[PDB]
Design an enzyme around this catalytic site. Structure first.
Site, short mmCIF file in Angstrom:
data_model
loop_
_atom_site.label_atom_id
_atom_site.label_comp_id
_atom_site.label_asym_id
_atom_site.label_seq_id
_atom_site.Cartn_x
_atom_site.Cartn_y
_atom_site.Cartn_z
N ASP A 16 0.87 -1.22 0.00
CA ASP A 16 0.00 0.00 0.00
C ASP A 16 0.88 1.22 0.00
O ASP A 16 2.12 1.10 0.04
CB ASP A 16 -1.11 -0.08 1.03
CG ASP A 16 -0.76 0.14 2.47
OD1 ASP A 16 0.46 0.05 2.74
OD2 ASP A 16 -1.64 0.43 3.27
N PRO A 17 0.30 2.40 -0.15
CA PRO A 17 1.12 3.62 -0.22
C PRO A 17 1.86 3.91 1.07
O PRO A 17 1.54 3.32 2.15
CB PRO A 17 0.06 4.70 -0.46
CG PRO A 17 -1.12 4.00 -1.06
CD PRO A 17 -1.15 2.68 -0.37
#
EC number: 3.2.2.27
Length: 218
Positions: free
Chosen positions: A68-69
């Protein structure tokens, strides 16, 4: 490029032709779940969730994928840290420096390397909370990664716990390496030969290797 309308922020998704086959499903799935994503302030902001869909796929041989970011300061470009402060990208750059023998550099970006698509499996998190949007992205994440893996020859995932069963999300037997995350204890990423193995696996498949030095910012 092309654009389509969604019923929620960011309202418009702009995409490269190579993503056309997934866009109908993407619009449907995003319209169904976006209210859960948009409850929270996110990394990245909504206007940046989909900026990687402007990237072509037909010239891509490797996907470098994290879960994920960054929990803060995500830009919409996986791994990107414009000021070169995030630990993940500094550790990646250090590994590539050892592999390539490039000692002098100022930064590193996986998104300027021919043949590489950097990827975040989930396209947002609640700000400050890794993996908080996993349940919401899951159907979109599978749709997009299956599309990527019609194009690339090697999938390199960073994080053994998060990606141990990544095969179960795919629909093809694409060559997959699951390595340590850059933040794994006992500096196990430093010793990880994953980046080097990618070009060995490409060459075995009669594909052009990645020139990892293209990621340096001078």
């Amino acid at each position: 490029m092309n654009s389509v309308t969604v019923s929620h922020a960011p309202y418009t998704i702009t995409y490269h032709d190579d993503w056309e086959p997934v866009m109908s499903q993407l619009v449907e799935f995003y319209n169904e779940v976006a209210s859960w994503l948009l409850r929270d302030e996110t990394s990245p902001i909504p206007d940046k969730f989909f900026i990687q869909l402007k990237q072509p796929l037909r010239n891509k041989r490797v996907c470098v994928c994290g879960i994920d970011p960054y929990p803060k300061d995500g830009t919409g470009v996986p791994f990107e840290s414009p000021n070169f402060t995030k630990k993940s990208i500094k550790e990646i750059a250090s590994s590539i420096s050892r592999l390539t023998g490039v000692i002098d550099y100022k930064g590193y970006n996986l998104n300027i390397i021919d043949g590489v698509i950097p990827w975040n499996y989930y396209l947002s998190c609640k700000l400050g909370e890794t993996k908080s949007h996993a349940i919401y992205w899951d159907k979109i994440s599978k749709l997009l990664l299956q599309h990527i893996t019609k194009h690339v020859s090697v999938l390199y995932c960073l994080g053994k716990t998060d990606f141990s069963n990544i095969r179960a999300k795919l629909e093809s037997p694409v060559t997959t390496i699951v390595g340590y995350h850059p933040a794994a204890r006992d500096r196990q990423f430093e010793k990880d030969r994953s980046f080097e193995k990618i070009n060995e696996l490409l060459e075995k498949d009669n594909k052009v290797p990645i020139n990892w030095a293209q990621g340096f910012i001078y």
